[PDB]
Amino acid sequence: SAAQGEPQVQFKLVLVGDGGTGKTTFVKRHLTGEFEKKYVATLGVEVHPLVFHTNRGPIKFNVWDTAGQEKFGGLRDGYYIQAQCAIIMFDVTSRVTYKNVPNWHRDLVRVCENIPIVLCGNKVDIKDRKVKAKSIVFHRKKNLQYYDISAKSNYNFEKPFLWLARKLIGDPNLEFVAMPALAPPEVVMDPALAAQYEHDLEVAQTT
Ligand SMILES: Nc1nc2c(ncn2[C@@H]2O[C@H](COP(=O)(O)OP(=O)(O)O)[C@@H](O)[C@H]2O)c(=O)[nH]1
Ligand SMILES: [Mg+2]
Structure with a gap:
């Protein structure tokens, strides 16, 4: 509402x-989320509060980043519980990580049925790409x-x-009115390559 003292919209x-x-590298791009992160000892999670400013006001994603436990097994139920997205x-650049996506999805939806989920293929700045648009089909x-x-x-x-904000708020016309402050790019994503990858996804989607 149009008043101070309102509960924040957070997920x-x-x-x-x-x-x-690249999960940790990804979440850390949001500079204030990194400054304000909190480590929860009982679960071994760092929660990053990521605020985005929309045409309908601020929205916060409390992003739960692991403390690396996925390297020796799955994540505990307490990690997933009450997740909203x-x-x-x-x-x-690593095909095996895509092959493991169905296992992550299975574990997630066992605890969190029917929440909105985005699949992300990271490291597309690396020239030698192994998992290309043609092969990315799990999301469909x-x-x-x-x-x-x-x-x-x-x-x-x-x-x-x-995408998640639009689904969660029930507003397909939601927009971000300003970008959060992000750590400046450490490498430049080639614009021509970006455009090619975007086209490749479009073609794949229409089959
Ligand atoms: N080139 C490139 N390297 C990345 C990117 N994201 C992460 N990395 C590297 O991948 C490695 C693993 O990243 P990390 O964030 O620790 O992965 P996590 O185990 O999933 O949390 C690190 O050496 C990062 O520097 C990216 O977008 N591009
Ligand atoms: Mg990590």
């Missing part, structure tokens, strides 16, 4: 995927939205969050 977002796919990440039968991302270049950073 628990779980960020899952194989170790080394999720991002499943893989690395487009599971109703996930897919985006290519590059955490190191901020490429497509806001896209998963905008």
Whole structure:
């Protein structure tokens, strides 16, 4: 409402995927979320409060980043519980990480039925891409939205969050009116390559 003292609009977002796919690098692009992060000892999670500013006011995604436990097993129920949305990440330079996406999805939806989920293929700044648009099909039968991302270049950073916000708020016309302050790109995502990858996804989607 148009008054001070209102409860903030916030959502628990779980960020899952194989170790080394770039989950932590991704969440850390949002500078204030990194400054304000909190480590929860009982679960071994760092929660990053990521505010985005929409045409309908601020929305916060409390992004749960693992403390690396996915490197030696699955995540505990306490990690997933009460999640309102999720991002499943893989690395487009490592086919195995895409092959493991169905396992992550299974584990997630066992605890969180029917939440909105974005699938992200990270590291698209790397020239030698292994998992290409043609091969990325898992999202279709599971109703996930897919985006290519590059955490190191901020490429497509806001896209998963905008899609999730629209689904969560029930507003297909929601827009982000200003970008959050992001760590500046460490590598430049080549614009021609970005355009080609976007076209490749479009062609794949129409089959
Ligand atoms: N080139 C490139 N490297 C990345 C990107 N994202 C992460 N990395 C690297 O991938 C490695 C694993 O990243 P990390 O964030 O720790 O992955 P996590 O285990 O999924 O949390 C690190 O060496 C990162 O520097 C990216 O978008 N592009
Ligand atoms: Mg990590």
